[PDB]
Design a protein around this ligand. Structure first.
Ligand code: NA
Ligand code: NA
Lengths: 102, 101
C-alpha cells in the first residue's frame, strides 16, 4: 500500500463570510511536496501560495502539518478542497466548504 | 486570465509500449505548470522525478510544457490535464486510451 497515510484530513465545514477557517492536513514522516487543490486547481506548492493573498499554509511542518488557512472567508471560497502529496502519490478526502453570507 | 494556452492536450489512442506526447504550451508564462493525472499532480514544472516514465519536454523558451510518456502501459490509461498555478488556468482534459496486445 502507499508507504504514507494521512494522520489528519480536511472535513466539510459551514462557515460565515468574513470568518477565518483552517482545513487540516497532516502526513507523518513525509518530506515531499504537498499541494492544496480548490475545485481541481492547485493553489501553490508547499508553503508558497503567494498567488493567493487569501490563502496560507500553516501548522507545524515538523509535525507533518500542511493546514490550509482561509484568512477571511468570502463566497468565492465556497468550494471543494483537497490535500495531496506528490512523492507519496496520495490524495485526501475532498472537503466542501460552505460559505454563508450575512 | 491575462494568460491562455496556445496548445492543449488532445485525446489519444496508443498501444502499450509506445511513447506518447501530450501537448501543452502557454506563451510568455514564467510561473509553475503542473501535469495532473486522474486528479493527482505528477510533479512541479520539469521535476517529475517521482515518475521515471513521465518527462516534461518541449521548448521552455516558447512556453512549452509537453508531457512525454516514454513507454505507455495500461496504468497510463487515464485523464490528463495541464494547469498553471500563477495564471490560474486549467487545460482541457485529455483522455489517453492505451490498447494492449
Ligand atoms: Na497566500
Ligand atoms: Na520523470
Amino acid at each position: 500500500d502507499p508507504v504514507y497515510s494521512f494522520s489528519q484530513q480536511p472535513q466539510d465545514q459551514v462557515v460565515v463570510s468574513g470568518q477565518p477557517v483552517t482545513l487540516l492536513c497532516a502526513i507523518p514522516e513525509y518530506d515531499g511536496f504537498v499541494l492544496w487543490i480548490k475545485d481541481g486547481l492547485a493553489l501553490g506548492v508547499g508553503r508558497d501560495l503567494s498567488s493567493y493573498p487569501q490563502y496560507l499554509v500553516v501548522g507545524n511542518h515538523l509535525s507533518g502539518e500542511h493546514h490550509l488557512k482561509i484568512l477571511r472567508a468570502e463566497l468565492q471560497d465556497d468550494a471543494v478542497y483537497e490535500c495531496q502529496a506528490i512523492q507519496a502519490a496520495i490524495r485526501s478526502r475532498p472537503a466542501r466548504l460552505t460559505v454563508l453570507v450575512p
